[PDB]
Design a protein around this ligand. Structure first.
Ligand code: HEM
Ligand code: HEM
Ligand code: HEM
Ligand code: HEM
Lengths: 139, 145, 145, 139
């Protein structure tokens, strides 16, 4: 990531703040309704609106993205355990990282209108593309 | 492929779309977020920075034509292959645009609708709009298949 | 859409294809080169290493049935959407396979035809077969549109 | 790449040797015939069979890949200049790297049938993927 993209990502994610866990839950809900093939990965979850488990898993996805922002420079080593889970154990199809990234971008657009510029949009896409690259790096 | 409550929600929101500005915001965002797409719009002029792209008057003007094509698609959801036969020929035989880029403009359009409607752009509304844009991308891709 | 001299080079080469081995070869290479596709085939047994996959009797067996569907598609290049209607329903509604994977199996088949036929697999022959495997891939993905 | 991967790539590309440029030229020809959208990036070229320009470019691509194998552990710094050329100046669509990677595999297979085992197939695909990621890194 370029110095300008790091500054733009930190600006945007700063303003998300204490609502990150809530936005992580909305992104997972949007993905399951819009791309219903992704549901085959959560057969052990209640995937109805306001499910305790989806709220629970929203916080886990958000805390991991906050970590990735604090370690943007050493992402491969910050997420290396999550790269093992998603490739080796779970066997997640790489195409599915692009569907969740799109659903996160739709969630931030809807909550942060003032912050979601063309410039900031572009930098957040590169950032989520970087996070997806690491999470599929055991392939 | 849209339930009755879907088609009503899609239509209801569309009517409130600023037709002058949404199509130019979506075409502008395609060109900034996915820069390889700028080589097909060489003759539109200055696309050197994000602020050049959004304010470029040819981009705004052409953005209205794209949004018009989408409205025409929404009117004919049961016959999209027939509505976009001429445009598919343009993009596929003449301009040689990879069909993956059609999916990228559809997804960028969904981002822009969420930017403008915020809370109203609910997950069930988003899911109806994804089927539509997938519908349009597959119809523009027909002359490859 | 193949030219007469494309369709005659596609049909000519296929007659020489060992229908027993190539099918298992194509299915085995997909599972080894793109390891996420193994989760669709859990009941086939041991896919832990490349030697376990290639020498796996259920993989070898299932390969014959895939190649056997490719052999029926050539016969009916003018009605693929029809030929592949039942398999479209199976792959998209029951199994939930991402259509990006259909293209990968088509491309792995092309690498295998190249491996066996060598210098007889000429650039113009490959461009004819790349038209076939895309046309197959699209036909399979119809139930998603 | 993994230790096993590095070994399979070095061993395969060792047995290419002098034929490197001949093989590169064939891959470009296979690309232009199979995927006709890629012909628009070379308007200043004679793209007819046995073309002198394609043979000379063939050798440039080949030499670029030999360096990448020889610097397998420092790939972003052995291909830094070519990302600038491909991403910033030429605006090459990222789908196109996947089409060339595939035609490069159909060539190595037609010519080295003994060396083109399924494990070596897997190793070369990860290598050309890695090369493709570096060349698109300025997006
Ligand atoms: C930016 C993208 C993603 C991030 C940051 C992410 C992060 C995480 C985290 C932090 C966990 C919990 C790990 C733990 O339990 O210790 C997890 C689990 C999981 N993720 Fe993801 N993930 C992402 C994308 C995906 C995608 C695209 C899929 C499937 C389509 C997926 C499927 C799963 C599944 C099935 C689990 C295990 C759930 C369970 O058994 O409790 N993830 N992910
Ligand atoms: C769903 C996606 C798309 C729709 C609905 C769409 C629609 C249109 C329409 C209506 C026109 C004007 C036709 C005319 O004036 O004759 C047009 C022109 C064009 N489109 Fe698209 N388009 C789409 C995607 C794309 C993409 C992804 C690209 C490039 C990456 C592209 C490149 C062009 C170009 C170069 C022109 C010609 C502009 C000129 O007059 O010089 N289109 N499109
Ligand atoms: C691209 C061309 C493909 C063709 C022509 C093809 C063909 C077939 C055929 C003929 C069957 C057997 C149907 C029956 O007799 O009941 C089948 C089953 C199946 N296919 Fe495919 N297939 C293709 C791609 C894929 C891909 C890409 C995947 C997964 C990544 C896949 C996964 C399966 C699975 C899981 C089954 C069910 C096998 C079982 O459990 O019995 N297919 N396919
Ligand atoms: C593994 C993939 C690739 C490698 C290693 C590669 C390597 C190279 C090299 C070494 C050059 C010449 C640089 C010089 O002047 O010294 C070059 C030029 C070029 N490449 Fe690539 N390339 C790759 C993929 C692609 C693809 C997929 C496209 C387009 C579809 C492309 C389009 C071009 C163009 C247009 C030129 C400039 C030709 C000229 O005007 O002189 N490259 N590439």
């Amino acid at each position: 990531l370029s110095p300008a993209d790091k500054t733009n990502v930190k600006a945007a994610w700063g303003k998300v703040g204490a609502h990150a866990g809530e936005y992580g839950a909305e992104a997972l809900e949007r993905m399951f309704l819009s791309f219903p093939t992704t549901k085959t990965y959560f057969p052990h979850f209640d995937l109805s609106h306001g499910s305790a488990q989806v709220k629970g898993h929203g916080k886990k996805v958000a805390d991991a993205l906050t970590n990735a922002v604090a370690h943007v420079d050493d992402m491969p080593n910050a997420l290396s355990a999550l790269s093992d889970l998603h490739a080796h154990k779970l066997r997640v199809d790489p195409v599915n990282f692009k569907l969740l990234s799109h659903c996160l971008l739709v969630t931030l657009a809807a909550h942060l209108p003032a912050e979601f510029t063309p410039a900031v949009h572009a930098s957040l896409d590169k950032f989520l593309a970087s996070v997806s690259t690491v999470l599929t790096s055991k392939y | 492929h849209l339930t009755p409550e879907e088609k009503s929600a899609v239509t209801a929101l569309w009517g409130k779309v600023n037709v002058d500005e949404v199509g130019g915001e979506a075409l502008g965002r395609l060109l900034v977020v996915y820069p390889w797409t700028q080589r097909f719009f060489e003759s539109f002029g200055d696309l050197s920075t994000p602020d050049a792209v959004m304010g470029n008057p040819k981009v705004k003007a052409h953005g209205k034509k794209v949004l018009g094509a989408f409205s025409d698609g929404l009117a004919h959801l049961d016959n999209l292959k027939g509505t976009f036969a001429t445009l598919s020929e343009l993009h596929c035989d003449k301009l040689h645009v990879d069909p993956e880029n059609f999916r990228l403009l559809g997804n960028v359009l969904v981002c822009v609708l969420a930017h403008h409607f915020g809370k109203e752009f609910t997950p069930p509304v988003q899911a109806a709009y994804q089927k539509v844009v997938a519908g349009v991308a597959n119809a523009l891709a027909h002359k490859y298949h």
